[PDB]
Amino acid sequence: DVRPKITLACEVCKHRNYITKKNRRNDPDRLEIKKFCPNCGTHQPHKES
Amino acid sequence: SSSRNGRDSAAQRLGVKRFGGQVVKAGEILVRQRGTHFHPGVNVGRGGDDTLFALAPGAVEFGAKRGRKTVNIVPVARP
Amino acid sequence: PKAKTHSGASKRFRRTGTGKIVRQKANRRHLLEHKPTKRTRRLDGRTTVSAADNSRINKLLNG
RNA sequence: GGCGUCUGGGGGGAACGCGGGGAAGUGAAACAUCUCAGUACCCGUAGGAAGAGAAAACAAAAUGUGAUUCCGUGAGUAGUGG
RNA sequence: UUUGAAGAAUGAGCCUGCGAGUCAGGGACAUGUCGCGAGGUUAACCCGGGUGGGGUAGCCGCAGCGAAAGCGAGUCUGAAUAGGGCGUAUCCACACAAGAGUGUGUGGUGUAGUGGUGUGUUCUGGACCCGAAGCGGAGUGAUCUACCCAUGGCCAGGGUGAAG
RNA sequence: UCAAACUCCGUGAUAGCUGGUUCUCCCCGAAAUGCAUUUAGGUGCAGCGUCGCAUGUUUCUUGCCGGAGGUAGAGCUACUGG
RNA sequence: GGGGAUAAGCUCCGUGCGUCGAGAGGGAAACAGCCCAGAUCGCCGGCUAAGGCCCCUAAGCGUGUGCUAAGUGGAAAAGGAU
RNA sequence: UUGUGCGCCGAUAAUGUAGCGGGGCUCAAGCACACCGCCGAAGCCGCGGCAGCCAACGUGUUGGCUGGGUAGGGGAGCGUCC
RNA sequence: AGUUUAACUGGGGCGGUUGCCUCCUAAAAUGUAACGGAGGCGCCCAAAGGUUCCCUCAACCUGGACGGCAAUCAGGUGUUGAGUGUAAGUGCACAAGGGAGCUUGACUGCGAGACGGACAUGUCGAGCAGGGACGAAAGUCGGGACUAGUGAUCCGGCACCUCU
Instruction: Give dist(CA B61, CA B23) in Å, integer.
Output: 10
How far is it, in rounded angstroms, from Cα C22 to Cα C46? Answer: 6
Alpha carbons A47 and A28: distance in angstroms, whole number:
14
Q: How far is A12 from chain C (nearest CA, A)?
A: 23
**Whole-angstrom distance, CA of residue C23 vs CA of residue B13:** 28
H/E segment holding residue C54: helix C54-62
Distance A41 CA to E81 C1' (A): 22
Resolution given for this structure, in angstroms: 3.6
Residue to test with chain A: of C31, C33, C34, C37, most A Cβ within 10 A: C33
Closest CA to A41 of A17, A8, A21: A17
Are B31 and B49 spatial neighbours (Cβ–Cβ below 8 Å)? no
**Structure letter (DSSP) for residue A12:** T
Q: Do the beta carbons of residue C27 and residue C35 sit within 8 Å?
A: yes
DSSP state of A32: E
- Technique used by the depositors: cryo-EM
